[PDB]
Design a binder for this molecule. Sequence first.
Ligand code: HEM
Ligand code: CAM
Ligand code: K
Length: 406
Amino acid sequence: ANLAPLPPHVPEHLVFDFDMYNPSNLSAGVQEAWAVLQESNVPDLVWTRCNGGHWIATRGQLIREAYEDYRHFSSECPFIPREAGEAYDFIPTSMDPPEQRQFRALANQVVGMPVVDKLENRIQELACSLIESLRPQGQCNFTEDYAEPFPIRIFMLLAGLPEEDIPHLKYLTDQMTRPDGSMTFAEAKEALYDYLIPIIEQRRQKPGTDAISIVANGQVNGRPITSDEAKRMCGLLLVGGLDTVVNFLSFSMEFLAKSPEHRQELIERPERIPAACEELLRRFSLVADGRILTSDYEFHGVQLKKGDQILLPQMLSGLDERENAAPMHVDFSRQKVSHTTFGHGSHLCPGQHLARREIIVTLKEWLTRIPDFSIAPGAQIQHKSGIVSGVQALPLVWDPATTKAV
Ligand code: HEM
Ligand SMILES: CC1(C)[C@@H]2CC[C@@]1(C)C(=O)C2
Ligand SMILES: [K+]
């Protein structure tokens, strides 16, 4: 295919041409497609000539180690291909400690556990209303009818943005994680910034109680945050709010629809939902970004060159059979659910608490109202791969007679 010429410093035996935006075994499921990187024929650290050429760490050990060592593995250029990585200037993700710290503190403020706790009632409220509205229909297009509106509307409420702007923003955020080829990466990013700029200016002058007002008027390093810094942070918040939980919920529901035994498990033993959420986060992990080498560095017997990009798939740690036995099997009773679904190191996800709350609320409220459901007959669910992977469509069906109006 479109393979870049092999750099002189890369041993031929370490080459494995994996395409993160279109993996070969995608039809088997996106996580399954990525897991081919963990078969016996693939070394721990390999070089793919796809997408401009870059390294890929395939084991949890290397992924965790790399995410911790920011001195060698910089977040300055975190996305593949390099073009995207270089245009990517979100805050604080494109920064390494110490610089990142002050901005991350501010981000924790607007999406951290305290915010989640205060927002739980709205989360509960929306989940219940959306699910009840669908219950009597006996069918739904999950991605469009719940997966997107639920987490996204909660985020828009948090950020104090009009739901009317969702379609526009959602299209843009997805061009940065799973480009469909209709927009260049930098242009999609700028479009996001063009939208935010006037809003940030407005909320710095006349601050509201929303997350954007909080960010735009925050302080970093003992001084006021700049309009541009606030912009670069809010841009990141939009992506996290619009293209993370949204995708994960579909992977989870697709699975539950296909496994009555697991649904039954959660209906008969509700207290197991939190554990189930965690196991699902491992099995259907969906993120994969990376870092750039700050200098020549030998890593686990492999010579890495300054400038080289290395993909450190957050998705792979939990699927690594070295971290979890029978990794592709969902066991809600797994004693130790090991994963790096929310990242690792200084950039570990601050919105993970909001994510878990939304997932757990979704599982409890959906199963209590629509306990029995399955994939629409004749439907063949397909996935999409990228920085954040997802489910293209998920047609679900159930018998309204077996549902319960709460
Ligand atoms: C299932 C849901 C989610 C997953 C799997 C996820 C995953 C991740 C991962 C892997 C990282 C680290 C990436 C890196 O090291 O380069 C991260 C960072 C981040 N996430 Fe999440 N995330 C989720 C939901 C959210 C939500 C809902 C928000 C908030 C709107 C959010 C906001 C952020 C921010 C601000 C960062 C950057 C933190 C920093 O750079 O210090 N995330 N997330
Ligand atoms: C890799 C991510 C999941 C993380 C939050 C949104 C995302 C796409 C980023 O750009 C940082
Ligand atoms: K950059």
